[PDB]
């Protein structure tokens, strides 16, 4: 893992970089399960 | 620079891996050459290899210093920076100066608050060829590491029976000619590796009448380092110690700069194996 970090290319681009998000700490954020519209919430309420 | 250094290492590592695979192929070509010259029959595995025989026509016209040093061996003089550990004592600073005088092209650098990655990265920018870092214990030198740039090797030594020149009265100033070098009792492949590392800290082509000699004598893996000044007399040679005296014992050799704790270890000292004291590796 330390080696993978060292040889990382800063210019690597993946289309998925749009969907994935990173935390202020710099660590990747993974959703627990993978918002509700007002119409959906109204039915559930 | 960073991208260039990265790929140069990957290409170099790839070359080593291929050469190990190609070592078998090289032996096979040697057998064919001997068979053709001697006229003796070729062995069965080689007799049935049509691809090898076809290749042999091109490979017939095929024909030392270590690869890290082969490029500059004897062309460019070394550039050496001698430093110490953080907050060095007064004696270690004196010893670092003594090591600086030992190598003609050495420059002493104060290590105040310098971090290791910056030190090597700064050294690589400036064209430094070797880096020497010294450690102590209560003002007694204990260790000496030598890192060769840009990609190693890094060799760590432990110093014993150190006698500095400042411990002498009215010793005087050293001579700083390019010194003659003596490497005695270095027989194994590891010894040849150690010799190559130490040989290239000095400039190439000392004058035949140079009056300063530095000797590294191997005695049971304890390399005695002495510095003498000689005068050729009518019935022999008379030498005088200049110092310092100290014995280094290798205990590690890594394929990389001293910053890289993850570098592959080329050789290490096993002290707890059962037959440790039986054999001397160097």
């Amino acid at each position: 893992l330390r080696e993978k970090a060292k040889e990382r290319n800063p210019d690597e681009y993946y289309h998925a970089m749009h969907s994935r998000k990173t935390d202020a700490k710099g660590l990747l954020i993974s959703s627990r399960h993978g918002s509700l519209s007002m119409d959906q919430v109204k039915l559930l309420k | 620079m960073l991208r260039r250094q990265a790929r140069e290492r990957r290409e170099y590592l790839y070359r080593k891996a291929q050469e190990l695979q190609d070592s078998q192929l090289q032996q096979k070509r040697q057998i064919i050459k001997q068979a053709l010259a001697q006229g003796k029959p070729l062995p069965k595995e080689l007799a049935e290899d049509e691809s090898l025989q076809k290749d042999f026509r091109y490979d017939q016209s095929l024909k030392q210093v270590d690869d890290e040093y082969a490029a500059t061996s004897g062309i460019m003089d070394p550039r050496i920076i001698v430093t110490t550990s953080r907050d060095p004592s007064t004696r270690l600073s004196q010893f670092a100066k003594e090591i600086k005088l030992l190598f003609p092209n050495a420059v002493r650098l104060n290590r105040g608050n310098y971090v290791m990655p910056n030190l090597v990265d700064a050294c690589k920018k400036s064209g430094t060829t070797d880096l020497v870092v010294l450690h102590e214990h209560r003002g007694v030198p204990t260790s000496l590491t030598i890192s060769h740039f840009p990609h190693g090797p890094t060799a760590q030594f432990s110093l014993h029976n150190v006698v500095m020149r400042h411990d002498i009265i009215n010793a005087g100033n050293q001579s700083e000619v390019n010194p003659h070098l003596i490497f005695d009792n270095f027989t194994t492949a590891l010894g040849k590796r150690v010799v190559c590392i130490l040989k290239h800290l000095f400039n190439a082509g000392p004058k035949k009448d140079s009056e300063r000699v530095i000797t590294f004598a191997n005695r049971g893996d304890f390399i005695s380092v002495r510095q003498h000044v000689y005068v050729r007399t009518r019935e022999g040679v008379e030498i005088a110690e200049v110092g310092p005296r100290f014995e280094m014992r290798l205990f590690e050799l890594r394929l990389g700069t001293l910053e890289n704790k993850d570098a592959d270890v080329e050789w290490q000292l096993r002290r707890f194996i059962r037959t440790a004291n039986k054999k001397d590796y160097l």
Binding site: - | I81, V107, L109, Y114, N118, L119, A122, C123, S126, T128
Partner: protein, 125 residues
């Protein structure tokens, strides 16, 4: 989407992130007003950008600075660099480039470290 820009300031291990958006002249550092930055003796240091270009330029923007690492002094320098860079970048992105050139000229004339990072790289001699 509200127009916004993001910039960084660095000094030794201290890192400041400045977010500059359209607003009403609300300048905060670490969730508190800039006037509470410490040490007080160096407070005017973090005021260097604002006083050089004038408070009128900030009246239409909100700046939020988050600072981590380093000590007090390096954190002050990170804050001032981040604020200056953020103001210049916002003027590039959402205001004319003439005003940007004036801002760069002012900051460079006073102190170039506001815009360009000051790192004391070792130099073997």
């Amino acid at each position: 989407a509200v127009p916004s820009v993001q910039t960084f300031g660095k000094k030794k291990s201290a890192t400041a992130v400045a977010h500059v958006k359209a607003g009403k002249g609300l300048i905060k550092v670490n969730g508190s007003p800039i006037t509470l930055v410490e040490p007080e003796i160096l407070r005017f240091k973090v005021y260097e950008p604002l006083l050089l270009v004038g408070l009128d330029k900030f009246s239409n923007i909100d700046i939020r600075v988050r600072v981590t690492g380093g000590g007090h002094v390096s954190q002050v320098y990170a804050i001032r660099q981040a604020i200056a860079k953020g103001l210049v970048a916002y003027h590039q992105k959402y205001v004319d480039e003439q005003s940007k050139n004036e801002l760069k000229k002012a900051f460079t004339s006073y102190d170039r470290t506001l815009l360009i990072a000051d790192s004391r790289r070792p130099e073997p001699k």
